[PDB]
């Protein structure tokens, strides 16, 4: 129905240069207008501007009306942000919504969400490292086994027990940063008669490094 | 600018209760006041606008309210799946202002966690780094302080921690504590553990190891 899929996660080192995508379907792109907020972590979700998809007339906020740039491909209905010269404070991820009404009161079909991580650092690539209990029988006739995927950046990385199959009880926890790198990891709880018997299998893929990993949890004890 | 204002910013009902979130514009604005609800690393859905006119498909359950400068969102019922950040808007004159979104806490009774630790994958310490994690499954309330002993020592520092938001399908909270040791200070010692305490229990929730068969 309306959908606005949107480009993925970006990296770039300060000062420099993005223009983050954003196709409209279901509706019909001329009679609707592009909405764009800034939801920065620790402050809140914040109006940027809108743009006119009929005319091609932008407004931008006061926060906004210089390095910010809206411009659209009318014709593959796609609107886009560029921000030129990323100062640093542009760490946050980018909404592009639709404007209901003229000047875009009501933002009604929300995009995804694009996340702008403006960064000097480098991509380096994970540790996917399987970790299976010292016994240790985790609840009656219950095993928790892990799955610590450190040492890489930028965020994110998909990790799946079992190619999305071990899917009820699994936590995969947030990643925190440690200056330049990230550690992240999750947990999956079995009955005893599934493993060592079946084949746990932590498949962890770090899509910026062209990584994929499979590291089977083998049952060492 | 009008300035839209909630307060406060977390907020807790039970399952089947109710909840009334404060929003406050500073000025007339009047009845042109968007709730949106933004899910849990979601977007957000825009719930009702005009103060009280439910958009396309958002459940009769979300009530909203108000006049002059004081509105409210009203919720009945609470699913445990309206955990989420709801945001005031102003749909008035221009810039649209948003308040600073309330974080709405369903409360469960309480759960007691399933603490378990693991040594270093032996592929760690052939890179020569000890990671020792310990997690603490399902537990509610949040308040959970985790402490790291090696050796009967306090081990403050070196240690990450991370806690998965509360659960939307059974409403408890989750943590990782990563200890992060050299190979050597790691194969330097022997009693590994990780406390916790929790209002579930006046005595440590204690698992600690060293490598041994099972």
């Known amino acids: 129905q309306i959908q606005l899929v949107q480009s993925g996660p970006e990296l770039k080192k300060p000062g420099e240069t993005v223009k983050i995508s954003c196709k409209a379907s279901?509706?019909?792109?001329?009679?609707?207008?592009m909405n764009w907020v800034k939801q920065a972590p620790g402050k809140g979700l914040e109006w940027m501007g809108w743009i006119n998809t009929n005319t091609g007339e932008p407004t931008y906020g006061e926060e906004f009306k210089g390095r910010f740039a809206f411009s659209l491909e009318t014709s593959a209905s796609t609107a886009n942000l560029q921000i030129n010269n990323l100062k640093n404070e542009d760490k946050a991820t980018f909404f592009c919504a639709r404007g209901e009404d003229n000047f875009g009161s009501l933002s009604d079909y929300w995009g995804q969400g694009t996340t702008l991580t403006v960064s000097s650092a480098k991509t380096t690539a994970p540790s996917v490292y399987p970790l299976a209990p010292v016994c240790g029988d985790t609840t009656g006739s219950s095993v928790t086994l892990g799955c610590l995927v450190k040492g890489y950046f930028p965020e994110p990385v998909t990790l799946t027990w079992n190619s999305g199959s071990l899917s009820s009880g699994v936590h995969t926890f947030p990643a925190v940063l440690q200056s330049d790198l990230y550690t992240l990891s999750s947990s999956v709880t079995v009955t005893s008669s599934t493993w060592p018997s079946q084949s746990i299998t932590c498949n962890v893929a770090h899509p910026a490094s062209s990584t994929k990993v499979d590291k089977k949890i083998e049952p060492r004890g | 600018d009008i300035v839209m204002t909630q307060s406060p910013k977390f907020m807790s009902t039970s399952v089947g209760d109710r909840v009334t979130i404060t929003c406050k514009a500073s000025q007339d604005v009047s009845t042109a006041v968007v709730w949106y609800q933004q899910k849990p690393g979601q977007s957000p859905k825009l719930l009702i606008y005009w103060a009280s006119t439910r958009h396309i498909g958002v459940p009769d359950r979300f009530a909203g309210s108000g006049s002059g400068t004081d509105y409210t969102l009203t919720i009945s019922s609470v699913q445990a799946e309206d955990l989420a950040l709801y945001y005031c808007?102003?749909?008035?004159?221009?810039?649209?202002?948003f308040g600073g979104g309330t974080k709405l806490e369903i409360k469960r009774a309480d759960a007691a966690p399933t603490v378990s630790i693991f040594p270093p994958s032996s592929e760690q310490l052939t890179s020569g780094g000890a990671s020792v994690v310990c997690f603490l499954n399902n537990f509610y309330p949040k308040d959970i302080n985790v402490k790291w002993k090696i050796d009967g020592s306090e081990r403050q520092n070196g240690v990450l921690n991370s806690w998965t938001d509360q659960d939307s399908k059974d409403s408890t909270y989750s943590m990782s504590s990563t200890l992060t040791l050299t190979k050597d200070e790691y194969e330097r010692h022997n009693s590994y553990t990780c406390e916790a305490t929790h209002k579930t229990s006046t005595s440590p929730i204690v698992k600690s190891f060293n490598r041994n068969e099972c």
């Open positions: 808007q102003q749909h008035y004159s221009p810039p649209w202002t």
């Open positions: 279901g509706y019909t792109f001329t009679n609707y207008g």
